[PDB]
Symmetry: D2
Subunit: 209 residues, 4 copies
Amino acid sequence: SMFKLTGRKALVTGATGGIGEAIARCFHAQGAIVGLHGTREDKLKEIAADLGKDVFVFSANLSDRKSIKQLAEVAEREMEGIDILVNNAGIDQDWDDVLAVNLTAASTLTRELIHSMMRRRYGRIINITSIQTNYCAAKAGLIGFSKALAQEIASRNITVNCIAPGFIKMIPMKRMGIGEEIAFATVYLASDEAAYLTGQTLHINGGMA
Amino acid sequence: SMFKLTGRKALVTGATGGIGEAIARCFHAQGAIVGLHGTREDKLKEIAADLGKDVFVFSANLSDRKSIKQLAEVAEREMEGIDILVNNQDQDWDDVLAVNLTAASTLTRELIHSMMRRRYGRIINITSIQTNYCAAKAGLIGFSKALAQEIASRNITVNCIAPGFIKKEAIMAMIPMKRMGIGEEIAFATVYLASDEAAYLTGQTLHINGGMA
Amino acid sequence: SMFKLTGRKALVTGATGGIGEAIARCFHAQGAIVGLHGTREDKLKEIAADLGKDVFVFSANLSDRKSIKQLAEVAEREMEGIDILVNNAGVRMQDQDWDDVLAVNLTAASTLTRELIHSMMRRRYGRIINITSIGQTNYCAAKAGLIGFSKALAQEIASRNITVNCIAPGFIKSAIMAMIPMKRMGIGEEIAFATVYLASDEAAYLTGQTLHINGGMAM
Amino acid sequence: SMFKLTGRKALVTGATGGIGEAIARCFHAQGAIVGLHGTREDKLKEIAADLGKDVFVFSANLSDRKSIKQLAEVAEREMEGIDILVNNAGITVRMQDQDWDDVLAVNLTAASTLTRELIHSMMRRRYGRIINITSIGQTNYCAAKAGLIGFSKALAQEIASRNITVNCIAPGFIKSAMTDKLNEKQKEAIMAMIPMKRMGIGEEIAFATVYLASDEAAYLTGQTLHINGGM
């Protein structure tokens, strides 16, 4: 019908709780073949059991580069080609850790999977930013990475977009958001209907300034 | 059932061709009760008939303030409450500002009173695809962002869609994606924004333009 | 010397109070030949008298198009060419009158600008600086419309060495403070100093921009 | 005497060439006491000699964290306090991952490290200026630049109440050895992107840095000045 993801293969990182879980569920309800990533194997299998069929579980430490490359190679083979990547995992030492986990991990995993998408002339990359100064830097860097990548691969029918969530469970709407509202947006961006939308950030935050 | 508009009342301006007609048809497909405004009454009824169920048709001069208030009053009454509004050299300046900015703000202001009373509404402004046009477009976006702040506490969202090139080819050189968009692509974005599933998304502009800078 | 406006002819609208007056005084101090627009003729003369020499005074209603065209006509003649235009001009229900807010805060600046770029284009040199407004929904709309106008016009005439920029002031001394990270209100002179910078030869490569001078306010 | 920097202490990184050198000369012309950082010790001394008075010279590898910390300590002690920091230094089978790490380290992390070392004293004096000059394979650079801008906007919120402003300048195409080398079609392709139909010059960036550093720009913070001829 509309905004269905039937038969598309999606890898979602940080799929263990919160927004990543909600994205996972929502993708599945729209007919996607979903691959869940996290570090808690027990919590993942629990989610895959809740949903049932067309679900894969993967473990990887996204703070380790070799481990990110391993995740890509394995998810791509076992899922047989990835269509949609949702980068959703996040959180001097502090600065380095946040940049590593909130920016570099997404760009590493993205660059591993874009080649196959470029061959197929079809893909969706969706970066979910974190909800202080280190986080703001990594977040703004991820958005800049996303916009520049969008320009690079636009002619290959791959879109690259970000979602910037507000306060999720000084908001003009006078309520916090829920993870499923982020999920719905991710379905929209992932769908064929959003083929002409790229290089964008959806701020989902109740009107925050 | 995701992104359905079942039973929602939607008023679409400029529904007679192009993006407006595509939005009207998509809304109808998603279960919306649709009000079609335009200036070509024969075209409006042809479209209405083609849809064939729960359709209203309205004529009005959007360059005339009093005419806009009348459209609002009549549409709100006949449709029994509107949930979704889609707003779709000196003489040249005034006319472009009148039709591309002032009309949308005037109709929006008239219809939000009843949306606020129901604590539910969607306002979606479609901007134009030159310095008069840019002023009107930027004004509309600024209008949308400021209004979103004003009425967010009533569960009314206000968003904009800025279309790129819609269907020689030095145009194709301007578009990184290397194709023009089609009107249905604007329509799909309007459906998303109109849905219950976009309730926390307000004050935003969706730039649907294949990556144009 | 750096950031001087020596010899340049500048027309400043809404020059009788606040930011306008500060712009005019700062322009004069930096060597500009200054033309003051306003409505209150007496206030114009008081300011002109303080600056002394190199000052022109013009009165005109910016609410009538013909009156704006006449101002452009007269000022361009008496000053013998205008290089710098500062668009600053901003119970009757005023704020909830969309038509009026748009007329005075957007259309007026666009009408005057378009009367005066003609000669700037011929000379291949000029500066347009639009000072935006400091009910609220109407003002935001006119402000965003002005910034859009300025950005588009900047593209059109960049090749003629005319820059077009806006300054968007935050809270300026004529709950509030909780919104300003710097925990103070700005003063008019601070907008004046930004206007000097943009008007200068040193800002020749900066066009189509908005300087938000607001103590770090969000949005 | 408008936009003067008389008696203010300014540290300028990447000051041996291009924009950095133009900033340093402009600052010195406005009465600033200037600290020149770079890697070419001799090129630094030439510039210092030409300026002739109220100049200090420093070397440091901005890709090494301990070396950035050392620069901050030694510059602040020698200059007896730093009021203005201009983060200018940067860069314009290879291991693509290493190239990512290097661009982030040099164009984002270096600036944030030096800034964090120097704002404490500024916060104590309740006065200061942080000015980040962003860079002019582009995807890695765009990420670092966007990151630096986001770092600057956040920091600006954090320290606005201490009257330290934090701003960025994003230059467009500025004339240099590199642009001078462009062939006819490359040149014509670049001009078509620039409404003003000319490249900027380094002094144009310098003038903007003077503006932001001045007392006249005390209410301007969290901003990026795009100096790019309409691009």
